[PDB]
Design a protein around this nucleic acid. Sequence first.
DNA 1: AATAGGAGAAGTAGGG
DNA 2: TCCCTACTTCTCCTA
Length: 90
Amino acid sequence: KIRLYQFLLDLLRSGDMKDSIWWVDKDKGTFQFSSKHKEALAHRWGIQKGNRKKMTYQKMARALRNYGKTGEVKKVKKKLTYQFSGEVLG
DNA sequence: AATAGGAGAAGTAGGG
DNA sequence: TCCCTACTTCTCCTA
């Protein structure tokens, strides 16, 4: 399979869905979702995983919040903004 | 009212 | 026979 953070970084480094996700500072590993178009990106993540239900941003964020312990993805005080770690970027 | 944010509980998929 | 990993799903509260 493929992990959730690896899936978001690939979209960023392929320029796929520029309307749903984008860098805020490639150096700081900061990225942000689109308020009005994030669900389109959420739908893809669910289909690509073959999940039983339709993936939503709420369920995707619930999984992103787990990365706070390990450290692959940390939340930022900005709206819909997150940040990769220096390790994953490498 | 809208939107984002959070998380415990219990569950599935896949591998060992 | 069971557990680990990595989410997933549902529900409820909160800013």
